[PDB]
């Protein structure tokens, strides 16, 4: 699991699909916080954490959306 902002996975987010909600257990560290998210991200299964919050102490607990990469399988769309 990748740490992104929802203003970085907006853009690729038709790509993706919000499997649940991670939550750190508050505002601990700012790059700790991110670790913690992945270490819950990565144990469900997901591709990418999308921080909607923000990150940098920003006035940030630390709730971000998980979301899995949509596989392909032979459909190579032409």
Request: a negative charge.
């Amino acid at each position: 699991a990748e740490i992104m902002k929802k203003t970085d996975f907006d853009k690729v987010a038709s790509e993706y699909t919000k499997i649940g909600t991670i939550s750190t257990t508050g505002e601990m560290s700012p790059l700790d916080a991110r670790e913690d998210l992945i270490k819950k991200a990565d144990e469900k299964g997901a591709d990418v954490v999308v921080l909607t919050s923000g990150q940098t102490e920003n006035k940030i607990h630390g709730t971000a959306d998980i979301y899995k990469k949509k596989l392909e399988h032979h459909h190579h769309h032409h």
